[PDB]
RNA sequence: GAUGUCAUACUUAUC
């Protein structure tokens, strides 16, 4: 489940704060 | 219904099993029974589309330690840890200039991805399993 | 069957010093088996290269005196 | 009295022409001196064999016929093949009877036709050499490449678009040849982008 | 020394594609491709024996990133 | 692959 949540999770929404 | 039986570009017909010539039609019914015929039949996407996304501001502490990052995020409510992803700044939304660099970034489900750049080229090791914790009770996760 | 190894020249004993005096059950073969990876990697370790003049060549002092020849 | 294979390679000058069965003939220096000449043309191979020299395609499918550009350019095979496909149709009662009285104009296509594609539109085979012998599997070694140049199917199979920008255009192992060099067994081979410009030299690849 | 393997081709791929791909990082000697004569079919690996094994050491270095008909072709020392 | 019996088919503008 892991590594489905892993997988499918958005990597180009990046946010430096 | 004989799968061996051919017809060749002469007018002729061809044992492709025993691999013989017959001039006639007689002779390739006559051909299926023998000894050598005989003998050679013998031998032969939906969790992707369901993510809630509100974007909350996270907050994140880091410091230089020596032998981390401690973002304090809000229950979730999931069994689905956060996870952290190293990747490189040639993909953006708008792909700036003189980006050259690696992101080191940490996703949740409820939450918006936060991300750190690292400007050296290795100095931790960004795996999950090796060097992440995540306190369920006290709703902190960290990796070194 | 006997007839199709009699015909052909199998069950033939031929002895190849080049390979460590390896077996071959046939002159096709052995001429087939003569250009192919072993026998290279057989001539590869006297030093002397995979060529055409190489081909029948058996002993290897007269493969040496061959390849000093050239 | 016969020699083996290795003093009769020793004895001529050119042993590549030596073979195993050349060593127990009635003259093995004239063999190897007829066998190493300029112009000579090698024996077939099947004069060792035990198929005859026709006994091996026999399962084996092939066209019936393959037709030049002249003759196709005619029409004639096509009104032969509706004449045979209408021939096929006809029973013996059709056949006996368009014998006593025939329908004239089969085709009746052109006259000048012919002698213009027999004459104008005449094209030359594909010949070959003298000493290129014909053998058995020599209809289906059709195997018999550059350095630098990739072909419409090796691009279709590894998913590269040869185009004239070279930023896009090489191989992903241009990347490789940039971080560890040129290749050590083409010193002259030039690629564009390393040793090569590359607006320039659009033919990803170039001995020189 | 002078022989590298090559894994992860395809069957549809054929052994004269295998040497033009080949061919662009050194001339190779020989290509042997193990393939069963009962069915007709390639293994899925191959044999590039080249000329020296400097330049079989280059092109097996050279090969880590070739990817033919969707699946990635490992090249190794052999 | 060879042998010896049988049948089919083909070639030489053969008669």
């Known amino acids: 489940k892991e590594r489905v949540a892993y997988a499918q999770i958005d990597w180009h929404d990046f946010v430096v704060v | 219904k004989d799968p061996y039986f051919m017809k060749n570009h002469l007018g002729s017909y061809e044992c492709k099993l025993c691999l013989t010539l017959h001039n006639n039609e007689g002779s390739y019914l006559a051909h299926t029974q023998g000894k050598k015929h005989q003998t050679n039949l013998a031998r032969r996407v939906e969790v992707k589309k369901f993510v809630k996304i509100g974007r909350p501001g996270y907050k994140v502490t880091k410091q230089r330690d020596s032998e981390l990052f401690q973002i304090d995020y809000p229950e979730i409510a999931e069994g689905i840890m956060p996870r952290h992803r190293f990747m490189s700044a040639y993909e953006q939304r708008i792909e700036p200039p003189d980006r050259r660099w690696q992101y080191l970034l940490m996703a949740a489900e409820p939450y918006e991805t936060i991300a750190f750049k690292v400007p050296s080229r290795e100095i931790d090791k960004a795996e999950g399993k090796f060097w992440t914790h995540w306190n369920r009770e006290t709703k902190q996760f960290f990796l070194q | 069957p006997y007839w199709l190894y009699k015909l052909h020249g199998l069950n033939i004993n031929y002895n190849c010093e080049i390979c460590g005096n390896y077996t071959y059950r046939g002159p096709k073969a052995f001429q087939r088996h003569f250009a192919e990876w072993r026998h290279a990697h057989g001539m590869r370790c006297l030093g002397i290269p995979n060529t055409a003049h190489f081909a029948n060549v058996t002993q290897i002092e007269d493969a040496v005196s061959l390849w000093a020849k050239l | 009295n016969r020699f083996t294979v290795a003093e009769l390679k020793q004895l001529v000058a050119r042993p590549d022409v030596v073979e195993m069965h050349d060593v127990t003939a009635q003259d093995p220096k004239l063999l190897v001196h007829l066998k190493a000449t300029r112009n000579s043309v090698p024996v077939p191979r099947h004069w060792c064999f035990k198929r005859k020299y026709l006994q091996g395609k026999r399962g084996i499918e092939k066209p019936p016929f393959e037709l030049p550009d002249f003759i196709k350019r005619t029409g004639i095979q096509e009104m032969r093949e509706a004449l045979q496909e209408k021939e096929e149709q006809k029973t013996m009662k059709s056949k006996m009877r368009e014998k006593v009285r025939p329908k004239m104009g089969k085709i009746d296509i052109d006259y000048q036709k012919l002698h213009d594609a027999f004459f104008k539109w005449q094209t030359k085979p594909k010949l070959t050499i003298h000493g290129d012998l014909y053998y058995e599997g020599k209809e289906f070694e059709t195997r018999l490449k550059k350095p630098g140049d990739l072909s419409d199917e090796l691009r279709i199979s590894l998913g590269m678009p040869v185009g004239p920008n070279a930023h896009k255009v090489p191989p992903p192992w241009l990347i490789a040849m940039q971080r560890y060099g040129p290749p050590p067994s083409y010193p002259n081979l030039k690629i564009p982008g390393l040793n090569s410009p590359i607006p320039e030299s659009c033919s990803f690849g170039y001995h020189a | ?78």
């Open chain 5, 1 to 78: 020394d002078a022989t590298v393997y090559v894994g992860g081709l395809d069957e549809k791929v054929s052994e004269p594609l295998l040497w033009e791909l080949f061919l662009q990082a050194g001339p190779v000697v020989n290509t042997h491709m193990p393939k069963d004569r009962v069915t007709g079919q390639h293994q899925g690996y191959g044999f590039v024996e080249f000329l020296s094994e400097e330049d079989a050491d280059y092109a097996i270095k050279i090969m880590n990133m070739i990817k033919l008909y969707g699946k990635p072709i490992r090249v190794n020392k052999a």
